């Protein structure tokens, strides 16, 4: 395919997010590289406006699923790559249990040889001393399955999952993730049979980064049809 060929090797990634959570405004800039042959993402983000007003883990899902490794027998179900280089719009609502919600719109496209994910985030109705603005979340992440089905109505895909954020008191906070992806261009795209992506994440800190930051490593692989 045309889009698939853009991902045969490692491609650099730029991510830019403008966010407003409960009126608290911030901006985050991140860089890294993706390698869809391994299904691997490596990224580092800094908050350029000072201290991030929400926990870094809550934004992991928001910060380029075109880098998933799709097994050889499944390449015709990879909506993400098939919508490239035109790219896709990724709109999503993340509902935090007994707390506020995020609404996100991202455009993920190629600019030159670099894959860019440009995000807009609006967050509302958050408890000011909740687990989010209260920074009560442990700095870690678990493995999850992302459920994907086609959406012919939009020539796109509908995708859902539930994130499990570990709380510092031993409890867990569920963030119900609903996201929709639609191509911008007019070239044909594959709408896949139902399947899923197994995702694993590891967060860390660069000891030499004086700025509020996060280092994210992800492994993502498609499965679920045989």
């Amino acid at each position, epitope marked *: 395919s045309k889009g698939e060929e853009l991902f045969t090797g490692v491609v*650099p990634i*730029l991510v830019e997010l403008d966010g407003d959570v409960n009126g608290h405004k911030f901006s985050v*800039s*991140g*860089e890294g590289e993706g390698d869809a042959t391994y299904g691997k993402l490596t990224l*580092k983000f*800094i908050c*350029t406006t000072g201290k991030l007003p929400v926990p870094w883990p809550t934004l992991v899902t928001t910060f380029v699923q075109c880098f998933a490794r799709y097994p050889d027998h499944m390449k015709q179900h990879d909506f993400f790559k098939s919508a490239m280089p035109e790219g896709y719009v990724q709109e999503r609502t993340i509902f935090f249990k007994d707390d506020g919600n995020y609404k996100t719109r991202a455009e993920v496209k190629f600019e030159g040889d670099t894959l860019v994910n440009r995000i807009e985030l609006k967050g509302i109705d958050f408890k000011e001393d909740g687990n989010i603005l209260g920074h009560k979340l442990e700095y870690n992440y678990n493995s999850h399955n992302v459920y994907i089905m086609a959406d012919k109505q939009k020539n796109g895909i509908k995708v859902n999952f539930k994130i499990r954020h570990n709380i510092e008191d031993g409890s867990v906070h569920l963030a119900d993730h609903y996201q929709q992806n639609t191509p911008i261009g007019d070239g044909p795209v594959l709408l896949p049979d139902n399947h899923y992506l197994s995702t694993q994440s590891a967060l860390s800190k*660069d000891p*030499n*980064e*004086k*700025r509020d930051h996060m280092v994210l490593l992800e492994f993502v692989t498609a499965a679920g049809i045989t």
Partner: nanobody
């Protein structure tokens, strides 16, 4: 992508409380550009920089208010104006640049380095 050089000028000797300017010229276009410093026993640490977008500037707390970084995207140059110097600012200062725009502050995130120019506050 590589083979871009950084040429430092300025610095030198000054009396405590004075002012000195560092300047750095790049052989070609570059992204975020910053200055680091190296005390003789310690090993280089970030002092201040600006992103290639020039939308983000950052200074360490120990320098806030006294130093001013600015850049000329056309001449491919940057400068650091240092005012109200203190004894603890004595060090070898390095110009640094990277291919991409994000103003990271880790030494490891920078792909190009000047030779280092000594600034000594001490009269």
């Amino acid at each position: 992508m590589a083979d871009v050089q950084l040429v430092e000028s300025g610095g030198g000797l000054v009396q405590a409380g004075g002012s000195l300017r560092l300047s750095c010229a790049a052989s070609g276009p570059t992204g975020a550009m910053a200055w680091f410093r190296q005390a003789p026993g310690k090993e280089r640490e970030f002092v201040g920089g600006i992103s290639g977008s020039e939308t983000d500037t950052y200074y360490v707390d120990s320098v806030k208010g006294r130093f001013t970084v600015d850049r000329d995207n056309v001449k491919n140059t940057v400068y650091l104006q240092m005012n109200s110097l203190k004894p603890e600012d004595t060090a070898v200062y390095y110009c640094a640049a990277r291919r991409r725009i994000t103003l990271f502050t880790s030494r490891t995130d920078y792909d190009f380095w000047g030779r280092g120019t000594q600034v000594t506050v001490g009269l």
